[PDB]
Amino acid sequence: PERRVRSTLKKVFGFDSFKTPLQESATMAVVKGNKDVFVCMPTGAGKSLCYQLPALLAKGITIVVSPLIALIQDQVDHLLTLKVRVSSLNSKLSAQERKELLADLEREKPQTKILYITPEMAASSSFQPTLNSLVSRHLLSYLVVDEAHCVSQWGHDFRPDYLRLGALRSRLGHAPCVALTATATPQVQEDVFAALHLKKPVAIFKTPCFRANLFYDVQFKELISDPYGNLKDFCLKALGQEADKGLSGCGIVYCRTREACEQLAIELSCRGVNAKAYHAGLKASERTLVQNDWMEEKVPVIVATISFDKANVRFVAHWNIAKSMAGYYQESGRAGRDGKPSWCRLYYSRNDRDQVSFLIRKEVAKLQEKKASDKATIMAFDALVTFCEELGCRHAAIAKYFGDALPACAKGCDHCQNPTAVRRRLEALERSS
Amino acid sequence: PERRVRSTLKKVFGFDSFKTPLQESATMAVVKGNKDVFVCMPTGAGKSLCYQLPALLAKGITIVVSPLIALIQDQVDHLLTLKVRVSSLNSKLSAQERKELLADLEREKPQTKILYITPEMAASSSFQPTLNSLVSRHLLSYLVVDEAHCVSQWGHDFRPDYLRLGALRSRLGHAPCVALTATATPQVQEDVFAALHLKKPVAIFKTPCFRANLFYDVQFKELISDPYGNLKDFCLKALGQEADKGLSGCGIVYCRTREACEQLAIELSCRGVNAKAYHAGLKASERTLVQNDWMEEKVPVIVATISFKANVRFVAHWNIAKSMAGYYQESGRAGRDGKPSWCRLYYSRNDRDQVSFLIRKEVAKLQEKKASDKATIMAFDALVTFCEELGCRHAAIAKYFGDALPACAKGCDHCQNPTAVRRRLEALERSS
Amino acid sequence: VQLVENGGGCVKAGGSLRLSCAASGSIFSINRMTWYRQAPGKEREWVAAITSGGSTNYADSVKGRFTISRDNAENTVYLQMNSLKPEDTAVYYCEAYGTYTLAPTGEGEYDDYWGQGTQVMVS
Amino acid sequence: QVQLVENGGGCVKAGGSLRLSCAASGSIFSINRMTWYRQAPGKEREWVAAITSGGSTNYADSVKGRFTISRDNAENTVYLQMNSLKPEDTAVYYCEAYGTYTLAPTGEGEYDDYWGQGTQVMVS
Ligand SMILES: [Zn+2]
Ligand SMILES: [Zn+2]
């Protein structure tokens, strides 16, 4: 029950309350085990606990799969430092240690509560009799699969062994499963559901993407006569919520070419607002020093270029549209990460859109020369372009592409606030283009 | 799992396996607890074990309800001598004992595995808060209703508190139910299902009526030239299966009037076969002496009359039983052993009228003190029809007890010579 | 044991029509045979039932609409509509309340079994 | 939760025509594919046709000559157009909506498919 899971989390994670009500629901569903559950959260949201808690709650020896051995080691260490029973059947284990782990899994009453194994290990013939014995004795309480998005080629990560993990799910069908993912699109979610052969009735727990504190708005460089002045005005309005509050937060700007970021930073400094390029060409020491300077309030807005994170950032200017819509959302997430309100602004231009499309096509062709991933990234770029040109609720488009529940943003959305202005901007773009 | 069931059986029961495969299936279904179960076996079949094993196996507490407190005490003692823990909620128990039982029930995870409560106490307000606490803690696992036929006024026995036991079952519906009976009439079975409020889907486990070693047939007094000679022939044939075997087994003759049974015994003595009246007129010591003499081979066939052996060759019915269930019970006395046995009934127009008058008098006496009398009259009419039916006898018995019809390829009077049965019925119709 | 429907068809107004619901397997007796109406986006409502011993129960409009007759020995029930109308048009389902089945092994079932549906429309 | 309902069911003469419409109830993002199924009393269920997102359609040649399916994801509605009807296709038509995906502000969803009530049809 609720008390049992709360006590288990206090003993393991030491959290007085769950990170999010979605985590409550996902953990309840996993503990119930009535059917599979597909739960997705961003990194750092304690998504692993959703399967760690029920795995220990159930008497059966739960088994989980993760792609990386560095990852598997990190989670095993994190569970060990919390006294949580855990083991790894990776090839790194010494011959004697590997045999001991195999015997412990094979023998009745496995000592390990949750056992992590790399996807290829489940395909290894050595573990086959072990899995047969566990399924015969229904020793596998739950079968969670970390990084479930790797099964789908459209996701940022792909692993050929997740196809075999699907067949493994086909085994021990009596026990349910838990599918984790950092960022899963509805197409990716459907692909994961179909490949893993999960029992069709599944409770999906995906965090909504709208940020009541965050605000979005798209701008057209051609429409604005002085885009630099518009950016300066946006920075001035964002760095201070009120006159008494004064300057607060930080700012970041992205670009594809280091020279572009250098020029943008030079222009910003000329205007009056301090800004450092922080581009890749800048040496490592200089880059980290610029990042540290931007962390404090000394630099109202420091150009980030390829990479930034920061606790609270007021805005994130996108002079050049991102390569992927999901990538753009992740870039904007660090903006306003704290509970304070934030304002996000894009700078979409036809020339920049064409340039990024050409670069993406060239990259896809190069990758194909050495196919599904190219199509997926092209689709992400097209979705980002549509978001830029979509004349409607921005959070609605974000939810549509990520497939999470649509938003109800009464305030904090440009389209929902002044739809007439959005229509006017769209008409202006159409006349210009 | 089956391994746990066998381990418990060896622990509390001391048996290698269930005595009856039907009992094993019923116990497995009860252990599964997927839904309610109804069971009906004769005395000594092992229903006690059937509803005791899952209670011990189940992690939660089981609540058993029995009408007579004496039976509750007997079952409590039988469980005490065994490994299973048991307790009694009798009001006659000492105030200290009652308080201890109430505290144990209220305490979380009570040590008791099966708890017995008489229906009167179950309906009492004192037991109400305890039940509320148990249902709040969902400690209750199964609800066994022993002698469930008492709810149905049509059954042999009746208990008004079972109407309240039905609502009791209504509480804590998550716990499956186990409705046990000794003799389940299909109408009584439906009445038990409806009154106790069991879930619509239930697995019924009834012991078939037919026995491969038992034979049934009716010879009409008017049809037979001399019923005494026919009874003598039946006794002689059933006493020895083969000429080499010789006289073996035991015999029994039933009648309504003790004087009639004494007359029958003297007539058998006149024939030449040793017999004992064993009737109400016979003194108690003489009654025991006659019963003993019957148990030995010194008396091939003795008259039993009202009162009742390890192996009886046959069960003759001079006067047809007033209750068809009574006829079945009398027949069961015969063929209890593994060797083959035969059963004959003496139904005639005069005998039919006599038993009808007796049943009418019994119904009038009962009414002087409706559904119970109606059931008794229905049983009498069913027995009359069975004596005058045109078909398999075992099938008719099963229909009266409402179980699956038999596959009696051999050992059935109708199957062996259906033409003979038809001719006998035609002769009876011509005479009547 | 499953229930099977037969005799389903759309008949013009004022035209009688016969439906039959038959059980599968060996059932010793059925407590009653009840029928249920059903319409798109509408729960299934009881209309009439026939109980062993000649007892039968209808409703006002149901009685004025059709007549039912069930038999445990035959282990089947038959519905007969007289003077059908466009107003009374709905798919039908069978209750089979208190269906008591059993085998010589003694394993039985007292659950009520529902069969497939049979629709009827009238011009 | 999602609920499915049929609309436009009735018996017509040979060579007639009509439409069987199926919709959804609640908040649904997108159905993987809507798959009708034909099943009649005493007749085993048969894969009759199916429509998936993007316009791709699957069906049987005999059913193609008989019927044709077409659905819209934005409307989340699938219509089976009856043309040149024949008395052989008299089975009750159930609406599958294979691969339903539900969303709520709380994040809880449901991937299970929801089957509709359906409706039959007869011909002279
Ligand atoms: Zn909006
Ligand atoms: Zn027979």
Coordinates of N, CA, C and O in Angstrom, one line a residue, chain C:
Chain C
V1 N -19.9 -24.2 -21.1 CA -21.3 -24.1 -21.8 C -21.6 -22.7 -22.2 O -21.5 -21.8 -21.5
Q2 N -21.9 -22.6 -23.5 CA -22.2 -21.3 -24.2 C -23.6 -21.4 -24.8 O -24.1 -22.4 -25.0
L3 N -24.1 -20.2 -24.9 CA -25.5 -20.0 -25.5 C -25.4 -19.5 -26.9 O -24.5 -18.7 -27.3
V4 N -26.3 -20.1 -27.8 CA -26.3 -19.8 -29.2 C -27.7 -19.3 -29.6 O -28.7 -19.8 -29.1
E5 N -27.7 -18.2 -30.4 CA -28.9 -17.6 -30.9 C -29.2 -18.0 -32.3 O -28.3 -18.3 -33.1
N6 N -30.5 -18.2 -32.6 CA -31.0 -18.5 -33.9 C -32.3 -17.8 -34.2 O -33.1 -17.5 -33.3
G7 N -32.5 -17.6 -35.5 CA -33.8 -17.0 -36.0 C -33.8 -15.5 -35.9 O -34.8 -14.9 -35.5
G8 N -32.7 -14.8 -36.2 CA -32.5 -13.4 -36.2 C -32.7 -12.8 -37.5 O -32.0 -13.1 -38.5
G9 N -33.6 -11.8 -37.7 CA -33.9 -11.2 -38.9 C -34.8 -10.0 -38.8 O -35.6 -9.9 -37.8
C10 N -34.7 -9.0 -39.7 CA -35.5 -7.8 -39.6 C -36.8 -8.1 -40.4 O -36.8 -8.5 -41.6
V11 N -38.0 -7.8 -39.7 CA -39.3 -8.0 -40.3 C -40.0 -6.7 -40.3 O -39.9 -5.9 -39.4
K12 N -40.9 -6.6 -41.3 CA -41.7 -5.3 -41.4 C -42.6 -5.2 -40.3 O -42.8 -6.1 -39.4
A13 N -43.3 -4.1 -40.2 CA -44.2 -3.8 -39.1 C -45.4 -4.8 -39.1 O -45.9 -5.2 -40.2
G14 N -45.9 -5.2 -37.9 CA -47.0 -6.1 -37.8 C -46.6 -7.6 -38.1 O -47.5 -8.4 -38.3
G15 N -45.3 -7.9 -38.3 CA -44.9 -9.2 -38.6 C -44.3 -9.9 -37.4 O -43.3 -9.4 -36.8
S16 N -44.8 -11.1 -37.1 CA -44.3 -11.9 -36.0 C -42.9 -12.5 -36.4 O -42.5 -12.6 -37.6
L17 N -42.2 -13.0 -35.4 CA -40.9 -13.5 -35.7 C -40.4 -14.3 -34.4 O -40.7 -14.0 -33.3
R18 N -39.6 -15.4 -34.7 CA -39.2 -16.3 -33.7 C -37.7 -16.3 -33.5 O -36.9 -16.3 -34.4
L19 N -37.3 -16.2 -32.2 CA -35.9 -16.3 -31.8 C -35.7 -17.6 -30.9 O -36.6 -17.9 -30.2
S20 N -34.5 -18.2 -30.9 CA -34.3 -19.4 -30.1 C -32.9 -19.2 -29.5 O -31.9 -18.9 -30.2
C21 N -32.8 -19.5 -28.2 CA -31.6 -19.5 -27.4 C -31.3 -20.9 -26.9 O -32.2 -21.4 -26.1
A22 N -30.3 -21.5 -27.3 CA -30.0 -22.9 -27.0 C -28.6 -23.0 -26.2 O -27.6 -22.3 -26.7
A23 N -28.6 -23.8 -25.2 CA -27.4 -23.9 -24.4 C -26.5 -25.0 -25.0 O -27.0 -25.9 -25.8
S24 N -25.2 -25.0 -24.6 CA -24.3 -26.1 -25.0 C -23.8 -26.8 -23.8 O -23.6 -26.3 -22.7
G25 N -23.5 -28.1 -24.0 CA -23.1 -29.0 -22.9 C -24.3 -29.7 -22.2 O -25.4 -29.7 -22.7
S26 N -23.9 -30.2 -21.1 CA -24.9 -31.0 -20.3 C -25.1 -30.2 -19.0 O -24.3 -30.1 -18.1
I27 N -26.3 -29.6 -18.9 CA -26.7 -28.8 -17.7 C -28.0 -29.5 -17.1 O -29.0 -29.8 -17.9
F28 N -27.9 -29.9 -15.9 CA -29.0 -30.6 -15.3 C -30.3 -29.8 -15.2 O -31.4 -30.3 -15.6
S29 N -30.2 -28.6 -14.8 CA -31.3 -27.7 -14.7 C -30.9 -26.2 -14.7 O -29.7 -26.0 -14.3
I30 N -31.7 -25.3 -15.1 CA -31.5 -23.9 -15.1 C -32.5 -23.2 -14.3 O -33.7 -23.5 -14.4
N31 N -32.0 -22.4 -13.4 CA -33.0 -21.7 -12.5 C -34.0 -20.9 -13.2 O -35.2 -20.9 -12.9
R32 N -33.6 -20.2 -14.3 CA -34.5 -19.4 -15.1 C -33.8 -19.0 -16.4 O -32.5 -19.0 -16.4
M33 N -34.5 -18.7 -17.4 CA -34.0 -18.2 -18.7 C -34.5 -16.8 -18.9 O -35.7 -16.6 -19.2
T34 N -33.7 -15.8 -18.8 CA -34.1 -14.4 -19.0 C -33.4 -13.8 -20.2 O -32.3 -14.2 -20.6
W35 N -34.1 -12.9 -20.8 CA -33.6 -12.2 -22.0 C -33.4 -10.7 -21.7 O -34.0 -10.1 -20.8
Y36 N -32.5 -10.1 -22.5 CA -32.1 -8.7 -22.3 C -32.0 -7.9 -23.6 O -31.5 -8.4 -24.6
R37 N -32.6 -6.8 -23.6 CA -32.5 -5.8 -24.7 C -31.2 -5.1 -24.7 O -30.5 -5.1 -23.6
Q38 N -30.8 -4.6 -25.8 CA -29.6 -3.8 -25.9 C -29.6 -2.9 -27.2 O -30.0 -3.4 -28.2
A39 N -29.2 -1.7 -27.0 CA -29.2 -0.7 -28.1 C -27.8 0.0 -28.2 O -27.1 -0.1 -27.2
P40 N -27.5 0.6 -29.3 CA -26.2 1.3 -29.4 C -26.0 2.3 -28.3 O -26.9 3.1 -28.0
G41 N -24.9 2.2 -27.6 CA -24.7 3.1 -26.4 C -25.7 3.0 -25.4 O -26.1 4.1 -24.8
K42 N -26.2 1.8 -25.1 CA -27.3 1.6 -24.1 C -27.0 0.3 -23.4 O -26.7 -0.7 -24.0
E43 N -27.0 0.4 -22.0 CA -26.8 -0.8 -21.2 C -27.8 -1.8 -21.5 O -28.8 -1.6 -22.2
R44 N -27.6 -3.1 -21.1 CA -28.5 -4.2 -21.4 C -29.5 -4.3 -20.3 O -29.2 -4.4 -19.1
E45 N -30.8 -4.2 -20.7 CA -31.9 -4.2 -19.7 C -32.7 -5.5 -19.9 O -32.9 -6.0 -21.0
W46 N -33.2 -6.0 -18.8 CA -34.0 -7.2 -18.7 C -35.4 -6.9 -19.3 O -35.9 -5.8 -19.1
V47 N -36.0 -7.9 -20.0 CA -37.3 -7.8 -20.6 C -38.2 -8.8 -20.0 O -39.3 -8.5 -19.6
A48 N -37.8 -10.1 -20.0 CA -38.7 -11.2 -19.6 C -37.9 -12.4 -19.2 O -36.7 -12.4 -19.5
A49 N -38.5 -13.3 -18.5 CA -37.9 -14.6 -18.2 C -38.9 -15.7 -18.0 O -40.1 -15.4 -17.7
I50 N -38.4 -16.9 -18.2 CA -39.3 -18.1 -18.0 C -38.5 -19.0 -17.0 O -37.3 -19.2 -17.1
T51 N -39.3 -19.4 -16.0 CA -38.8 -20.3 -14.9 C -39.4 -21.6 -15.0 O -40.6 -21.8 -15.3
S52 N -38.7 -22.6 -14.6 CA -39.2 -24.0 -14.6 C -40.4 -24.1 -13.7 O -40.6 -23.3 -12.8
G53 N -41.3 -25.0 -14.1 CA -42.6 -25.2 -13.4 C -43.7 -24.4 -14.0 O -44.8 -24.3 -13.3
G54 N -43.6 -23.8 -15.2 CA -44.6 -23.0 -15.8 C -44.6 -21.6 -15.4 O -45.5 -20.8 -16.0
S55 N -43.8 -21.2 -14.5 CA -43.8 -19.8 -14.0 C -43.0 -18.9 -15.0 O -42.0 -19.3 -15.5
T56 N -43.6 -17.7 -15.4 CA -43.0 -16.8 -16.3 C -43.3 -15.4 -15.9 O -44.3 -15.1 -15.3
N57 N -42.4 -14.5 -16.2 CA -42.5 -13.1 -15.8 C -42.2 -12.2 -16.9 O -41.2 -12.4 -17.6
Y58 N -43.0 -11.2 -17.2 CA -42.9 -10.2 -18.2 C -43.0 -8.8 -17.7 O -43.0 -8.6 -16.4
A59 N -42.9 -7.8 -18.5 CA -43.3 -6.4 -18.2 C -44.5 -6.0 -19.1 O -45.0 -6.8 -19.9
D60 N -45.0 -4.8 -18.8 CA -46.2 -4.4 -19.5 C -46.0 -4.3 -21.0 O -46.6 -5.1 -21.8
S61 N -45.0 -3.5 -21.5 CA -44.7 -3.4 -22.9 C -44.1 -4.7 -23.4 O -44.4 -5.1 -24.5
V62 N -43.3 -5.4 -22.6 CA -42.7 -6.6 -23.0 C -43.8 -7.7 -23.2 O -43.8 -8.4 -24.2
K63 N -44.7 -7.8 -22.3 CA -45.8 -8.7 -22.4 C -46.6 -8.4 -23.7 O -47.0 -9.3 -24.5
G64 N -46.9 -7.1 -23.9 CA -47.7 -6.7 -25.1 C -46.9 -6.9 -26.4 O -47.5 -6.9 -27.4
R65 N -45.6 -7.1 -26.3 CA -44.7 -7.2 -27.4 C -44.5 -8.7 -27.9 O -44.9 -9.1 -29.0
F66 N -44.0 -9.5 -27.0 CA -43.7 -10.9 -27.3 C -44.1 -11.8 -26.1 O -44.6 -11.4 -25.1
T67 N -43.8 -13.1 -26.4 CA -44.1 -14.2 -25.4 C -42.9 -15.2 -25.4 O -42.4 -15.5 -26.5
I68 N -42.4 -15.6 -24.2 CA -41.3 -16.5 -24.1 C -41.7 -17.8 -23.5 O -42.7 -17.9 -22.8
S69 N -40.9 -18.8 -23.8 CA -41.1 -20.2 -23.2 C -39.8 -20.9 -23.2 O -39.2 -21.1 -24.2
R70 N -39.4 -21.2 -21.9 CA -38.1 -21.9 -21.7 C -38.4 -23.3 -21.1 O -39.4 -23.6 -20.5
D71 N -37.4 -24.2 -21.4 CA -37.5 -25.6 -20.9 C -36.2 -26.1 -20.5 O -35.2 -26.0 -21.4
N72 N -36.0 -26.6 -19.3 CA -34.8 -27.2 -18.9 C -34.5 -28.5 -19.5 O -33.4 -28.9 -19.8
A73 N -35.6 -29.4 -19.6 CA -35.4 -30.7 -20.2 C -35.0 -30.6 -21.6 O -34.0 -31.3 -22.0
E74 N -35.6 -29.7 -22.4 CA -35.0 -29.3 -23.7 C -33.8 -28.5 -23.6 O -33.0 -28.4 -24.6
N75 N -33.6 -27.8 -22.5 CA -32.4 -27.0 -22.3 C -32.3 -25.9 -23.3 O -31.3 -25.6 -23.9
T76 N -33.5 -25.2 -23.5 CA -33.5 -24.1 -24.5 C -34.7 -23.3 -24.3 O -35.7 -23.7 -23.7
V77 N -34.7 -22.1 -24.8 CA -35.8 -21.1 -24.7 C -36.1 -20.5 -26.1 O -35.3 -20.4 -26.9
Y78 N -37.4 -20.2 -26.3 CA -37.9 -19.6 -27.5 C -38.7 -18.4 -27.2 O -39.6 -18.4 -26.4
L79 N -38.4 -17.3 -28.0 CA -39.2 -16.1 -27.9 C -40.0 -15.9 -29.2 O -39.4 -16.2 -30.3
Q80 N -41.2 -15.4 -29.1 CA -42.1 -15.2 -30.3 C -42.6 -13.8 -30.2 O -43.4 -13.5 -29.2
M81 N -42.3 -13.0 -31.1 CA -42.9 -11.6 -31.3 C -44.1 -11.7 -32.1 O -44.1 -12.3 -33.2
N82 N -45.2 -11.1 -31.7 CA -46.4 -10.9 -32.4 C -46.6 -9.4 -32.6 O -46.6 -8.7 -31.6
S83 N -46.9 -9.0 -33.8 CA -47.2 -7.6 -34.2 C -46.0 -6.7 -33.8 O -46.0 -5.8 -32.9
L84 N -44.9 -7.0 -34.5 CA -43.6 -6.2 -34.2 C -43.8 -4.8 -34.8 O -44.5 -4.6 -35.8
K85 N -43.0 -3.9 -34.2 CA -43.1 -2.5 -34.6 C -41.7 -1.9 -34.7 O -40.7 -2.5 -34.2
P86 N -41.5 -0.8 -35.4 CA -40.2 -0.2 -35.5 C -39.7 0.3 -34.1 O -38.5 0.4 -33.9
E87 N -40.6 0.7 -33.2 CA -40.2 1.2 -31.9 C -39.4 0.2 -31.1 O -38.3 0.5 -30.6
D88 N -39.9 -1.1 -31.1 CA -39.2 -2.2 -30.4 C -38.2 -2.8 -31.3 O -38.5 -3.8 -32.0
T89 N -37.0 -2.3 -31.4 CA -35.9 -2.8 -32.2 C -34.6 -2.7 -31.4 O -34.2 -1.6 -31.1
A90 N -34.1 -3.9 -31.1 CA -32.9 -3.9 -30.3 C -32.3 -5.3 -30.3 O -33.0 -6.3 -30.5
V91 N -31.0 -5.4 -30.1 CA -30.3 -6.7 -30.1 C -30.7 -7.4 -28.7 O -30.9 -6.8 -27.7
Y92 N -30.7 -8.7 -28.8 CA -31.1 -9.5 -27.6 C -30.0 -10.4 -27.1 O -29.2 -10.9 -27.9
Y93 N -29.9 -10.6 -25.8 CA -29.0 -11.4 -25.2 C -29.7 -12.3 -24.2 O -30.8 -12.0 -23.7
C94 N -29.0 -13.4 -23.8 CA -29.6 -14.5 -22.9 C -28.9 -14.5 -21.6 O -27.6 -14.3 -21.5
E95 N -29.7 -14.6 -20.5 CA -29.1 -14.6 -19.1 C -28.6 -16.0 -18.8 O -27.4 -16.2 -18.5
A96 N -29.5 -17.0 -18.8 CA -29.2 -18.3 -18.3 C -28.8 -18.3 -16.8 O -27.8 -18.9 -16.4
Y97 N -29.6 -17.6 -16.0 CA -29.3 -17.5 -14.6 C -29.5 -18.8 -13.9 O -30.4 -19.6 -14.2
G98 N -28.5 -19.1 -13.0 CA -28.5 -20.3 -12.2 C -28.4 -21.6 -13.1 O -29.1 -22.6 -12.9
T99 N -27.5 -21.5 -14.1 CA -27.3 -22.7 -14.9 C -26.4 -23.7 -14.2 O -25.2 -23.4 -13.9
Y100 N -27.0 -24.8 -13.8 CA -26.3 -25.8 -12.9 C -25.9 -27.0 -13.8 O -26.7 -27.8 -14.3
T101 N -24.6 -27.0 -14.1 CA -24.0 -28.1 -14.9 C -23.2 -29.0 -14.0 O -22.8 -28.7 -12.8
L102 N -22.9 -30.2 -14.5 CA -22.2 -31.2 -13.7 C -21.8 -32.4 -14.7 O -22.4 -32.5 -15.8
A103 N -20.8 -33.1 -14.2 CA -20.3 -34.3 -15.0 C -20.3 -35.5 -14.0 O -20.3 -35.3 -12.8
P104 N -20.2 -36.7 -14.6 CA -20.1 -37.9 -13.7 C -18.9 -37.8 -12.8 O -19.0 -38.5 -11.7
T105 N -17.9 -37.1 -13.1 CA -16.8 -36.9 -12.2 C -17.2 -36.0 -11.0 O -16.5 -36.1 -9.9
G106 N -18.3 -35.3 -11.1 CA -18.7 -34.4 -10.0 C -18.4 -33.0 -10.1 O -18.8 -32.2 -9.2
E107 N -17.6 -32.6 -11.1 CA -17.2 -31.2 -11.2 C -18.3 -30.5 -12.0 O -18.6 -30.8 -13.1
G108 N -18.8 -29.4 -11.4 CA -19.9 -28.7 -11.9 C -19.7 -27.2 -11.9 O -18.7 -26.7 -11.3
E109 N -20.7 -26.4 -12.4 CA -20.6 -25.0 -12.5 C -22.0 -24.4 -12.3 O -22.9 -24.9 -13.0
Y110 N -22.1 -23.4 -11.4 CA -23.4 -22.8 -11.2 C -23.5 -21.4 -11.7 O -24.3 -20.6 -11.3
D111 N -22.5 -21.0 -12.6 CA -22.5 -19.7 -13.2 C -23.5 -19.5 -14.2 O -24.0 -20.4 -14.8
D112 N -23.9 -18.2 -14.5 CA -24.8 -17.9 -15.5 C -24.0 -17.6 -16.8 O -23.0 -16.8 -16.8
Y113 N -24.5 -18.1 -17.9 CA -23.7 -18.1 -19.2 C -24.5 -17.2 -20.2 O -25.7 -17.3 -20.4
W114 N -23.7 -16.3 -20.8 CA -24.3 -15.4 -21.8 C -23.8 -15.8 -23.2 O -22.6 -16.1 -23.3
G115 N -24.7 -15.7 -24.1 CA -24.4 -16.0 -25.5 C -24.2 -14.8 -26.4 O -24.4 -13.7 -25.9
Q116 N -24.0 -15.0 -27.6 CA -23.9 -13.9 -28.6 C -25.2 -13.2 -28.7 O -26.3 -13.7 -28.2
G117 N -25.2 -12.1 -29.4 CA -26.4 -11.3 -29.6 C -27.1 -11.6 -31.0 O -26.5 -12.0 -31.9
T118 N -28.4 -11.3 -31.0 CA -29.2 -11.4 -32.2 C -30.0 -10.1 -32.3 O -30.8 -9.8 -31.5
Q119 N -29.8 -9.4 -33.4 CA -30.5 -8.1 -33.7 C -31.8 -8.3 -34.5 O -32.0 -9.3 -35.2
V120 N -32.6 -7.3 -34.4 CA -33.9 -7.3 -35.2 C -34.3 -5.8 -35.4 O -34.2 -5.0 -34.5
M121 N -34.7 -5.5 -36.6 CA -35.2 -4.2 -36.9 C -36.5 -4.3 -37.7 O -36.8 -5.4 -38.3
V122 N -37.3 -3.3 -37.7 CA -38.6 -3.3 -38.3 C -38.8 -1.9 -39.0 O -38.4 -0.9 -38.5
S123 N -39.3 -2.0 -40.3 CA -39.5 -0.8 -41.1 C -40.5 0.2 -40.4 O -41.6 -0.2 -40.0

